[PDB]
Amino acid sequence: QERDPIWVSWSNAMHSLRVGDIDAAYAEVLCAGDQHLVIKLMDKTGPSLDQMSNEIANEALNFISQFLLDHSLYDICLSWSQQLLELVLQDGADTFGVPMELKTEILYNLQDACSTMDPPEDWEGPAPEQLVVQLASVWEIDLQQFDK
Secondary structure: OOOOHHHHHHHHHHHHHHOOOHHHHHHHHHHOOOHHHHHHHHHHHOOOHHHOOHHHHHHHHHHHHHHOOOHHHHHHHHHHHHHHHHHHHHHOOOOOOOOHHHHHHHHHHHHHHHHHOOOOOOOOOOOHHHHHHHHHHHOOOOHHHOOO
């Protein structure tokens, strides 16, 4: 008889949040494997790329890239994408040290979501097409070179 280890991880993460260590909270949950706990954490904190190390930001963006393929997570993905754009505009295109492959996956997956799903009902940010056009520009990726 022992607790599911994911809840011990969650407890460690909640303590980290209590003391303001968002980076450590993410490091714990992103490592615990469990997708539903990653979503649970993101739902609680909101977009948190401004409080993360490059290493943890890259782990989080890897999840966002995968989440973009799921229409139930579109709101979350747009919110994080918007924050990412704002931060790369402010702190520099390469501030987070995201590799070109991941940059490309994020754009490709966001463009795909944009093409197939409608903006969530409560979404109030830029049109999804504006996010992907602007992010592609900052990252110097030509969206029209993706094949249709």
